[PDB]
Design an enzyme around this catalytic site. Structure first.
Site, PDB file in Angstrom:
ATOM      1  CG  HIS A   1     108.899  72.264 120.995  1.00 34.11           C
ATOM      2  ND1 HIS A   1     108.475  71.364 120.031  1.00 34.11           N
ATOM      3  CD2 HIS A   1     110.238  72.441 120.861  1.00 34.11           C
ATOM      4  CE1 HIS A   1     109.570  70.984 119.384  1.00 34.11           C
ATOM      5  NE2 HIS A   1     110.652  71.607 119.847  1.00 34.11           N
TER       6      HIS A   1
ATOM      7  N   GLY B   1     110.548  66.067 112.994  1.00 35.34           N
ATOM      8  CA  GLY B   1     110.621  64.842 113.789  1.00 35.34           C
ATOM      9  C   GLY B   1     111.961  64.611 114.475  1.00 35.34           C
TER      10      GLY B   1
ATOM     11  CB  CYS C   1     112.301  68.391 118.118  1.00 32.14           C
ATOM     12  SG  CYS C   1     112.055  69.727 116.906  1.00 32.14           S
TER      13      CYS C   1
HETATM   14  C1  RXU Z   1     111.036  75.901 110.095  1.00 31.18           C
HETATM   15  N1  RXU Z   1     110.056  76.014 111.161  1.00 31.18           N
HETATM   16  C2  RXU Z   1     108.744  75.974 110.938  1.00 31.18           C
HETATM   17  O1  RXU Z   1     108.270  75.868 109.810  1.00 31.18           O
HETATM   18  C3  RXU Z   1     107.834  76.049 112.154  1.00 31.18           C
HETATM   19  N2  RXU Z   1     108.460  75.643 113.415  1.00 31.18           N
HETATM   20  C4  RXU Z   1     107.941  76.399 114.565  1.00 31.18           C
HETATM   21  C5  RXU Z   1     108.749  76.153 115.816  1.00 31.18           C
HETATM   22  C6  RXU Z   1     108.844  77.146 116.787  1.00 31.18           C
HETATM   23  C7  RXU Z   1     109.604  76.960 117.926  1.00 31.18           C
HETATM   24  C8  RXU Z   1     110.251  75.761 118.106  1.00 31.18           C
HETATM   25 CL1  RXU Z   1     111.206  75.515 119.541  1.00 31.18          CL
HETATM   26  C9  RXU Z   1     110.177  74.748 117.170  1.00 31.18           C
HETATM   27  C10 RXU Z   1     109.442  74.950 116.001  1.00 31.18           C
HETATM   28  C11 RXU Z   1     109.465  73.905 114.881  1.00 31.18           C
HETATM   29  C12 RXU Z   1     109.209  72.482 115.430  1.00 31.18           C
HETATM   30  C13 RXU Z   1     109.975  71.571 114.473  1.00 31.18           C
HETATM   31  N3  RXU Z   1     111.026  72.444 113.920  1.00 31.18           N
HETATM   32  C14 RXU Z   1     112.087  71.930 113.103  1.00 31.18           C
HETATM   33  C15 RXU Z   1     113.273  71.537 113.711  1.00 31.18           C
HETATM   34  N4  RXU Z   1     114.307  71.036 113.028  1.00 31.18           N
HETATM   35  C16 RXU Z   1     114.169  70.899 111.706  1.00 31.18           C
HETATM   36  C17 RXU Z   1     113.041  71.261 110.996  1.00 31.18           C
HETATM   37  C18 RXU Z   1     111.963  71.811 111.709  1.00 31.18           C
HETATM   38  C19 RXU Z   1     110.734  72.338 111.000  1.00 31.18           C
HETATM   39  C20 RXU Z   1     110.618  71.897 109.554  1.00 31.18           C
HETATM   40  C21 RXU Z   1     111.955  71.966 108.841  1.00 31.18           C
HETATM   41  C22 RXU Z   1     112.972  71.063 109.501  1.00 31.18           C
HETATM   42  C23 RXU Z   1     110.846  73.754 114.244  1.00 31.18           C
HETATM   43  O2  RXU Z   1     111.644  74.647 114.041  1.00 31.18           O
HETATM   44  C24 RXU Z   1     108.477  74.210 113.719  1.00 31.18           C
END
Ligand code: RXU
Ligand code: RXU
Ligand code: CL
EC number: 3.4.19.12
Lengths: 305, 305
Positions: free
Chosen positions: A41, A143, A145
């Site tokens: 991603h 950040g 990931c």
């Molecule tokens: C909570 N998620 C979102 O608001 C949107 N998110 C869509 C999305 C869709 C698919 C995939 Cl594989 C990744 C992702 C995101 C990428 C980054 N990420 C994430 C990872 N670890 C911790 C946190 C986050 C987001 C903020 C909170 C802390 C996600 O889940 C982002």
């Protein structure tokens, strides 16, 4: 004496962490030999995430579209390919700090250490378990990931997890290092949720054995139980079924303390039916399930790396 | 999201761990530049511990009586001196992996990471706090002496603890890196015992602010309190007195959440009186006191949910 949630020493993994930037997205990569592994991603924008065609997004990218930074040195990407949900970036420099390693897929109930990273720089290390519902209860911000989970056996690092996403309940989902998700999750912005979780029974029993080893014996009783009667009770409290394999795995702890597994199962049945009655076990008022039988043996023996 | 007891990445400290042997005693040493720091009791036998005369035991030793092993390489000792309860062994090789470092003496309530080691080899990393009674609740077995505690704010390692002993209750005592013990403890087998411990109030408050940041407010109330009335209640539950310094230190967490420090003190008074009534705060059924205000700011999101 003492019992702590202990993580493996992270040094061998710190020397593999890099920053991967593609477009406006920046995350972490794992640099082993001349390949950098990161979530696929990294090639997506927020709008792409809604319904991504990863092969179509990838074909439009060149090697110079990927910026890999190892410390303050820029690595040159000379190739790129995709394996499941993981992007493999071929770089022109082999990591001189590559440890002896394996990629392993873990089962629910197994524990591992997570080295949380931001911008390719490690910030912390903590221990956690693969839940029966395939999520992990980690601590991750935006950040993070590409952060990895691992175990160590002597000198060899077994990489078992790569962080991809956070679910609505604040729990985490990711893949093995071959890009296969743990659990029924997909890497896209769509409605997704953690299933109902259960307690890892064999792990609670291992932690009760750890309490006995450390001097906490108030929960022991004169009673025993059959494996079937114990499972009928456990099923009612959302505890995972205990199998004959689990009893075999608890053998060394059953020998070190002189308490049979079914003898200890009768103590857990009483704790499930009555609670702790104002008491604690190893400083906790809840039954802890994120220490495997092996973690208990290792911590109560002093195994080094 | 999420909140875990997180330790600092241990790599910078792993590259400093060595094995120190004197006669039949073997423990850990910290190798920084051309000096190896270890507990002075490495020169003692079990009988010597009742009433050791360290000066008299040390004068009978030569440089070649100390065996220092760094990995599978033998280091040569070319000098030895004692500073308080630590032995400083001058070696002929400077550690090429010496990180940027400082020696800092911490106050009760402050947290740090511990790299537990056996025979100069790291086995695990965990987070803990200097208790108000100057002990730590560590996880240490025989052979762990010389293991160190540290913080890594920026790329600088601040060494704050060296492990020396276990008290009758299973808690641990040790020194700063200048050899000065934390607490009224001595490196002698005397009837010394840990004093009655208390809960680190400023740390519980910081962890309640972390819970609010992570999206939970069930424990708050419409009441406030004076600092003196809060302290009169807190001391009845064996909680440390909260000072004006503690109130000042909680300022940023109070601003980020909009909850006044004395209003969070009122929630804490109510939680002490009522318990949690089947609820948890950040996955715990007890009030957690081993996260400082600084640890919460470091781990938690800058944005409240
Ligand atoms: C909570 N998620 C979102 O608001 C949107 N998110 C869509 C999305 C869709 C698919 C995939 Cl594989 C990744 C992702 C995101 C990428 C980054 N990420 C994430 C990872 N670890 C911790 C946190 C986050 C987001 C903020 C909170 C802390 C996600 O889940 C982002
Ligand atoms: C429990 N105490 C003892 O058995 C005797 N101990 C007297 C003693 C007195 C003063 C000093 Cl400064 C050191 C020491 C010893 C040196 C090693 N050590 C120790 C350290 N960490 C963890 C564990 C131990 C002992 C076994 C349990 C785990 C001690 O306390 C030994
Ligand atoms: Cl301090």
């Amino acid at each position: 004496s003492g019992f702590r949630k202990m993580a493996f020493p992270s040094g061998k993994v710190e020397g593999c962490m890099v920053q991967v930037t593609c477009g406006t997205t920046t995350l972490n990569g794992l640099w082993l030999d001349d390949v950098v592994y990161c979530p696929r991603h990294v090639i997506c924008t927020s709008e792409d995430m809604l319904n991504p065609n990863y092969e179509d997004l990838l074909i439009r990218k060149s090697n110079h579209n990927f910026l890999v930074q190892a410390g303050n040195v820029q690595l040159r990407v000379i190739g790129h390919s995709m394996q499941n949900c993981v992007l493999k970036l071929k770089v022109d420099t082999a990591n001189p700090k590559t440890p002896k390693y394996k990629f392993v897929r873990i089962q629910p109930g197994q524990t591992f250490s997570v080295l949380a990273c931001y911008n390719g720089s490690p910030s912390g290390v903590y221990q956690c378990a693969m839940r029966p519902n395939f999520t992990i209860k980690g601590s991750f911000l935006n950040g993070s990931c590409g952060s990895v989970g691992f175990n160590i056996d002597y000198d060899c690092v077994s990489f078992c997890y790569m962080h991809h996403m956070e679910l609505p309940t604040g729990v985490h989902a990711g893949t093995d290092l071959e890009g296969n998700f743990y659990g029924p999750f997909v890497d896209r912005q769509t409605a997704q949720a953690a299933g109902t979780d259960t307690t890892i029974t064999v792990n609670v029993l291992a932690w009760l054995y750890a309490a006995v080893i450390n001097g906490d014996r108030w929960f022991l009783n004169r009673f025993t139980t059959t494996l079937n009667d114990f499972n009928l009770v456990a099923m009612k409290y959302n505890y995972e079924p205990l199998t004959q394999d689990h009893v075999d795995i608890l053998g060394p702890l059953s020998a070190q303390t002189g308490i049979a597994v079914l003898d200890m199962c009768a103590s857990l049945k009483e704790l499930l039916q009555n609670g702790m009655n104002g008491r604690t076990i190893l400083g906790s008022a809840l039954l802890e399930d994120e220490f495997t039988p092996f973690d208990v043996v290792r911590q109560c023996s002093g195994v080094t790396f």
